[PDB]
């Protein structure tokens, strides 16, 4: 029997942390380790319930104990909760300090340690090593590894039975859901550490003595559903196993090869698309293995019958669709803050195999992480798969390329399903895009060396002209311009060494622009354009100002012309333009001109402010338009030229042209803030879907705050009339005091954390803004307001009735509003410094009225 504590296994592991392995304890608990997580004999007994329900119980390691009734109930809650033997369940409560459910902890900690140890040994110690050799040597470990995965499966169903039992009773409360997340967690960790062990056993060679394990594993994996994300946890072992085919005796490599071609002719193979993929990868690797010992291997073989015919078969059975899905469902492209997709490409390309979801944990798991140790084996092994395919499979790529250029016929009603059918090459491009996105430590392989196959691969892909391949190419490269360092190569790649040049790209964009407005005097174009923009976006973001500045020479004027047309891609172009906007305020004049033309070209202005708000609301007619507009504006009014370690725009400077709009309207920046405040911020508090509410709230708050820092106040505390009038800080104060405006800024503070860590920023901004207003409320009312009111010139946007408003409204809704004051109170403690140290500043100002 096994020592059912978790303290021998904790301390053993800690020894090894610092190379203190005592052969003593290790040799003691050896067979417990070989058993991994299994409790394969001692499950729930009733010959052990009578034993327990007397109150006197006996352990296998000697002594016995008197057991009261509180203990008996913790112990049968274990056996009923975990189909576990009752006296085992008791050794487990004894071993770990008796508190409310600490037997359930020792059960899981015991297993977790075991697994981690095995994993440490089979992955950090050498193969010749003494214990690696002890551990493996019975071969009892190898015969349990697959069982140990299956055990996790059965338990996760045990859990779902239990769940379902709880719902029929309607006892499916909060604290049930919680003692399940607790176990579903411990198990997912076990699966993830069992991934490591399996991989380790491949790299150590233990499961590669012959073809037997591979086939049995390949079976085991094929039992899961085609969309069980648990498949991923076997990909490191399988990927690396095929990539060390040399370890196997040739005799057996040959037998698998044969086996597999037989498998691809079996009919019901196509309902196991994961086998198809794995097989296909085997072939990608086999190729190189034949070539490594030609005389005995390669020369034996006929390439058309022994390789190309089957690989082709696997591609037609969706082998690539499955690689894309592996790639995409582990991708961290959501982290790429420069990347933005404007068209759902994954739904055009993946239409035959389901997305992977951790369905044995579902019925609260949106996205899953892999351990560091596992992320590393996966990434490394899979990168090696993608690159093997690149170098060793060029013939298949050209085969497919050529296939596709021929298949679809002009003059037909193509459906998305039709367009996707043969798009196997484009799928492979997307596999690259998902897998390398945000992973610069690998992305860089493509650009690192101009001889390398990877770099060649790119040159090749850059000559596929098929509109869909061309756009998928554009997307792929955006993924690969991730670093500040990769972005710069991608900048060179189109400037210097290729058939496609930055100018050609703008030239496409220009041509489409003509075609589109002439038609008015299509999905294929959305796909192409959306990708063009996705790419120019990604790079323009990630590069310095010089480089930004050249790309502007190429793209600004054409992007400008494109947003004049009404596409659904206006917003998208706006986001790109904004990436090109330079830091120096001086250099922004061409962009401000653009935008003011855009808004006011077809305007019918008159005496009313409303006329100017309509200019905006006629043009910026849909959500995406607005959102893009706000990012552009946010960048155009941003403060770069600032006083040394202040945050205030150096006294005297503006972020835009003097007398903006001169010649076609009452001039100046004011109307922009009329739109932004009243036409938009006023109405976010009734935007449909929260994530989009936040998506527009947050630009606006950033803008508002920028404006407030946008005039050096302390020149006064511690033609200048004109500067004061031109300055955005004026209209910004003027609307902050409208109530609809200070109310919305104030709720942000009422309901806080409730985006995600994006929503938490929106909150800091809210607070910082209010503080800033209090600091300078005074300075606006004495200095600024009158300067403008009294010496403001009238060829500007300046309301007839410009006045002070909500001095009493803003205060009474702040000072007399309570829960705001209370909420602020409750923030002084919170972790966030920006939130706390500002909340405190607000309270201190308020505090200087002293009393209620």
Cβ neighbours of residue 841 closer than 8 Å, sequence gap 6 or more: 771
Chain centroid, CA 568 distance in Å: 25
Unique residue bearing structure tokens 């938490």 = 760
Spatial separation of the C-alpha atoms in residues 243 and 830, rounded to whole Å: 51
Q: In Å, what is the CA distance from 618 to each residue of 567, 599, 612, 684?
A: 14, 8, 10, 18
For 183-302, list the strands marked E by DSSP: none
Please answer whether residues 33 and 110 qualify as being in contact, where contact means their C-beta atoms are separated by less than 8 angstroms. Answer: no
Spatial distance between the Cα atoms of 614 and 612, rounded to a whole number of angstroms:
5
- Other C-beta atoms closer than 10 Å to the C-beta of 24 total 9
CA nearest 721: which of 654, 788, 668? 788
Distance CA 1, CA 59 (A): 10
Q: With CA atoms as reference, report the closest residue to 255 among 241, 265, 245.
A: 245
The helix (run of H) or strand (run of E) holding residue 56 is: strand 56-58
| Contact indicator for 506, 554 with CB cutoff of 8 Å | yes
Dig out the tokens for 817 from the structure.
Answer: 């509003």
The backbone torsions φ and ψ at residue 649, rounded to the nearest 5 degrees and listed phi first, read -50, 125
Residue 298, burial from CB neighbour count under 10 angstroms (0-12, 13-18, 19+)? middle
Cα–Cα dist 843/824, whole Å: 7
Sequence-ordered list of residues with C-beta below 8 angstroms from that of 58, at least 6 positions apart, any chain: 51, 64, 87
Q: Which residue's entry shows tokens 């990630």? A: 542
Nearest-angstrom CA–CA distance, 635 and 512 = 27
The answer to whether the CB of 90 falls within 8 A of the CB of 75 is: yes
Q: What is the Cα 413 distance to its own chain's centre?
A: 36
CB neighbour list of residue 373: distance below 8 Å, 6 or more residues apart: 119, 123, 196
Give residues preceding each break in the chain, C–N over 2.5 A: 363, 521, 718, 754
Q: Render 57-93 in DSSP notation, one character per residue.
A: EE-SSS-EEE--HHHHHHHHHHHHHTTB-TTHHHHHH
Task: Count, in order, helices (H) and strands (E) of the chain.
Answer: 44, 2
Per-position DSSP letters for 91-153, written without gaps between them: HHHHHS--STT-HHHHHHHHHHHHHHHHHHHHHHS-SS-HHHHHHHHTSHHHHHHHHHHHHHH
Q: Tally the residues of the chain.
A: 852
Q: Per the structure block, which two tokens stand in for 68? A: 């009261």
Helix (H, G, I), strand (E, B) or coil at 667: strand
Asked whether 593 and 656 are in contact (CB, 8 A), the reply is no
Q: Position of tokens 């009329």?
A: 674
**Residue 431 near residue 323, CB atoms below 8 Å:** yes
What is the C-alpha separation between 42 and 51, in angstroms, rounded?
14
CA distances from 264 to 29, 202, 280, 289, 684 (A): 45, 25, 10, 21, 56
> From the CA atom positions of the chain, what is the Rg in Å?
33
Cα distance from N-terminal residue to C-terminal residue, the chain: 72
Closest CA to 121 of 215, 34, 236, 45: 34
CB distance 755 to 689 below 8 Å: no
- Give the DSSP letter of residue 538: H
Integer Cα distance of 299 and 477 in angstroms: 38
Alpha helices in 601-710 (DSSP H): 609-619, 623-636, 670-674, 690-708
Give just the sign of the alpha carbon dihedral 433, 439, 442, 445. Answer: positive
Which own/partner contact pairs does 642-649 have at CB distance under 8 Å and 24+ positions apart? Answer: 643/712, 646/712, 646/714, 647/709, 648/709, 648/710, 648/711, 648/712, 648/713, 648/714, 649/709, 649/710, 649/711, 649/712
Q: Which two tokens stand for residue 785?
A: 């307001």
Torsion-angle region of 2 (φ positive above 0: left; ψ -120 to 50: alpha; else: beta): beta
- Residue 451, classed as helix, strand or coil, is coil
Write b or e for each residue in 111-133: b if 16 or more Cβ atoms lie within 10 A of its Cβ, otherwise e: bbbbbbbbbbbbbebeeeeebbe
Distance CA 55, CA 37 (A): 29
Q: What is the resolution of this structure in A?
A: 3.2
């Amino acid at each position: 029997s096994l020592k059912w504590s978790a303290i021998p296994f904790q301390t053993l592991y800690r020894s090894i942390e610092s190379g203190e392995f005592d052969f003593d304890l290790f040799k003691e608990v050896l067979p417990d380790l070989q058993n991994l997580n299994l409790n394969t004999d001692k499950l729930k007994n009733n010959a052990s319930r009578s034993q327990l329900e007397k109150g006197e119980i006996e352990l296998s390691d000697g002594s016995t104990f008197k057991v009261n009734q509180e203990f008996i109930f913790e112990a049968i809650s274990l056996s009923d909760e975990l189909n576990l033997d009752e006296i085992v369940a008791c050794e487990l409560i004894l071993s770990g300090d008796t508190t409310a459910n600490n037997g359930k902890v020792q059960y899981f900690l015991r297993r977790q340690y075991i697994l981690q140890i095995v994993s440490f040994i089979v992955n950090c110690f050498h193969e010749d090593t003494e214990l690696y050799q002890e551990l493996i040597k019975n071969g009892a470990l190898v015969s349990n590894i697959l069982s140990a995965f299956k055990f996790i499966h059965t338990q996760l169903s045990e859990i779902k039975q239990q769940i379902n039992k709880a719902q029929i009773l309607e006892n499916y409360n909060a604290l049930f859901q919680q003692n399940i997340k607790f176990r579903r967690d411990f198990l997912l960790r076990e699966y993830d550490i069992l991934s490591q062990i399996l991989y380790g056993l491949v790299d150590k060679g233990a499961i590669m003595k012959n073809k037997d394990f591979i086939l049995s594993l390949l079976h085991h994996v094929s039992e899961l559903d085609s969309n069980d994300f648990f498949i991923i946890y076997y990909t490191p072992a399988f990927f690396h196993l095929f990539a060390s085919l040399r370890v196997l005796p040739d005799a057996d490599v040959k037998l698998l090869h044969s086996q597999f071609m037989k498998d691809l002719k079996d009919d019901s193979i196509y309902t196991k698309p994961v086998k198809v993929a794995l097989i296909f990868i085997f072939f990608a690797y086999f190729i190189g293995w034949c070539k490594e010992d030609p005389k005995r291997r390669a020369d034996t073989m006929d390439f058309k019958t022994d390789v190309d015919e089957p690989m082709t078969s696997a591609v037609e059975l969706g082998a690539i669709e499955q690689i894309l899905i592996f790639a995409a469902d582990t991708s961290i492209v959501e982290q790429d803050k420069s990347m933005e997709l404007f068209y759902d490409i994954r739904s055009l390309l993946e239409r035959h195999i389901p997305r992977l979801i951790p369905k044995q944990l579902l019925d609260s798991y949106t996205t899953i992480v892999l351990s560091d140790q596992t992320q590393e084996f996966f990434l490394s092994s899979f990168d090696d798969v993608l690159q093997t395919i690149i170098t060793d499979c060029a013939f298949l790529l050209t085969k497919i390329k050529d296939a596709e250029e021929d298949s679809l016929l002009s003059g037909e009603d193509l459906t998305l399903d039709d367009i996707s059918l043969k798009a196997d090459l484009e799928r492979f491009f997307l596999s690259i895009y998902f897998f390398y996105a945000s992973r610069p430590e690998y992305s860089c392989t493509f650009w690192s060396d101009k001889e390398s196959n990877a770099y060649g691969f790119i040159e090749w892909c850059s000559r596929c002209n098929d509109n869909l391949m061309r756009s998928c190419f554009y997307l792929m490269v955006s993924s690969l311009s991730f670093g500040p360092e990769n972005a710069l190569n991608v900048y060179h790649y189109f400037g210097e060494n290729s058939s496609i040049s930055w100018k050609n790209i703008a030239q496409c964009l220009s041509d489409y622009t003509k075609k589109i407005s002439n038609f008015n005097s299509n999905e294929e174009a959305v796909i192409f354009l959306s990708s063009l923009l996705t790419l120019v976006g990604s790079v323009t973001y990630q590069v310095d100002e010089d480089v930004k500045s050249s790309l502007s020479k190429v793209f600004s004027d054409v992007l400008f012309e494109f947003t004049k047309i009404n596409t659904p891609l206006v917003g998208a172009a706006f986001k790109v333009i904004s990436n090109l906007v330079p830091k120096l305020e001086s250099s922004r004049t061409k962009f401000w001109s653009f935008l003011d033309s855009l808004i006011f070209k077809d305007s019918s202005l008159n005496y009313s402010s409303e006329s100017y708000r309509n200019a905006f609301t006629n043009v910026l007619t849909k959500y995406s338009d607005v959102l893009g507009f706000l990012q552009l504006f946010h960048n155009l009014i941003s403060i770069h030229s600032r006083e040394n370690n202040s945050e205030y725009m150096v006294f005297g400077k503006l972020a835009f042209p003097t007398r903006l709009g001169q010649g076609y309207r009452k001039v100046g920046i004011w109307p922009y803030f009329d739109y932004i405040f009243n036409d938009i911020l006023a109405h976010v508090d009734q935007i449909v879907d929260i994530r989009n509410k936040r998506a527009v709230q947050l630009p606006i708050l950033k803008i508002i705050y920028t404006g407030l820092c946008s005039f050096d106040y302390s020149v006064i505390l511690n033609n200048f009339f004109n500067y004061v009038q031109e300055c955005p800080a004026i209209p910004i104060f003027n609307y902050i005091f409208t109530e609809k405006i200070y109310k919305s800024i104030f709720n942000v503070v009422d309901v806080g954390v409730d985006g995600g860590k994006n929503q938490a920023e929106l909150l800091q901004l809210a607070v910082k803004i209010i503080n800033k207003v209090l600091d300078y409320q005074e300075t606006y009312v004495e200095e600024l307001f009158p300067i403008v009111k009294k010496h403001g010139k009238t060829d500007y946007f300046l309301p007839k009735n410009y006045s002070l408003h909500g001095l009493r409204s803003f205060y009474d809704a702040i000072f007399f509003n309570i829960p705001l004051v209370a909420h602020l109170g409750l923030y002084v403690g919170v972790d966030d410094q920006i939130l706390a140290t500002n909340s405190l500043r607000i309270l201190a100002k308020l505090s200087e009225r002293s009393n209620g």
